[PDB]
Amino acid sequence: TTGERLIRVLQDQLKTLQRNYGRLQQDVLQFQKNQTNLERKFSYDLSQCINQMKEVKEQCEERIEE
Amino acid sequence: GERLIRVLQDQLKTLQRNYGRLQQDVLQFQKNQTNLERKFSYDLSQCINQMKEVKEQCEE
Amino acid sequence: TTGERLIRVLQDQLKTLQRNYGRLQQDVLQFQKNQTNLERKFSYDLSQCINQMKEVKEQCEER
Amino acid sequence: GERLIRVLQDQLKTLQRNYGRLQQDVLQFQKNQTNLERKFSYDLSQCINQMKEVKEQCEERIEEV
């Protein structure tokens, strides 16, 4: 003992370390995998806005009674 | 005897501090990206709904 | 004029769209800023990892 | 008359290309984000992998004395 006691605190610090880091990994995995559906949603909405803009232009240009 | 263990104990407390900085950098980035996305998705929706309104103004 | 009332509505709406574009441009600029910032932080954290690794290495196996 | 209509047409068309560039800048930013995430995962893992080599090294050495 006395040196076994210190070694036990060291084992404790290491497994607290390891468990925290493992928890962070799956938090990063959670976030990043969930990011994909959002990136696709923005991409879609930006294209649609660009397409509606194109329909707007054609129709307003048609609105010529001048 | 050999207090390499007390050195290691010191290094693990430093490594725990540095993990703490890494965890807060990652989590802060994630929190800001989610808040900015709420705004980004609001502004995209606004382009869409505005463009719907212009179409019907030009269709009457 | 029916046409001159629509012209005023179209010019008001063009201003709102230009505003919308600038908010979208500022949104994308902020993604760029948050990202490069994280790249700078992560660069520092990685260096702290490698260099404390290197030194625990020499601390052990050489007493 | 169509002077104001001229410039409404001009401003709209310049806006349409600015949204176009906007769209290309989002696709590119998204993609670089993905690549930075992946290189950063790889580089931290290489550091952790060397960390673990030093653990085994330093646990072999604690009880050698």
- Test D62 with B1 for CB contact under 8 angstroms: no
* Tokens 């709102």 belong to residue: C16
* Tokens 């560039």 belong to residue: D21
| C-alpha–C-alpha distance, residues D44 and D59, integer Å | 22
| Joined tokens for residue D61 | 């050495």
Give the CA distances from residue D61 to residues A57, B30, C59, in Å, rounded to whole numbers and listed in that order.
76, 40, 11
Query: Any idea how long chain B is?
Result: 60
| Joined tokens for residue C57 | 């290495």
Of D16, D48, D62, the CB nearest to A53: D16
| C-alpha–C-alpha distance, residues A56 and B54, integer Å | 7
Residue A33: what are its φ and ψ, rounded to 5°?
-65, -40
Burial class (CB in 10 A: 0-12, 13-18, 19+), C2: exposed
- Test B40 with C27 for CB contact under 8 angstroms: yes
Q: Which residues of D touch C24 (CB under 8 A)?
A: 19, 22
Q: Which of A28, C33, B26, A44 is nearest to D27 (CA)?
A: A44
- Test B8 with D58 for CB contact under 8 angstroms: yes
Q: How many CA atoms lie within 13 A of A48 on its CB side?
A: 15
Distance of CA A17 to the CA centre of its chain: 25
Query: Any idea how long chain A is?
Result: 66
CA D17 to chain A, closest CA, distance in angstroms equals 10
The SS3 of residue D24 is helix
Helix axis angle for C2-59 and D2-62, nearest 10°, is 10
| C-alpha–C-alpha distance, residues C49 and B12, integer Å | 12
Annotated resolution, angstroms: 2.3
| C-alpha–C-alpha distance, residues D17 and A20, integer Å | 48
| C-alpha–C-alpha distance, residues D24 and A19, integer Å | 41
CA B56 to chain D, closest CA, distance in angstroms equals 18
- Test D19 with A43 for CB contact under 8 angstroms: no
Q: Which residues of D touch B3 (CB under 8 A)?
A: none
Residues 6+ apart with CB under 8 A from D17: none
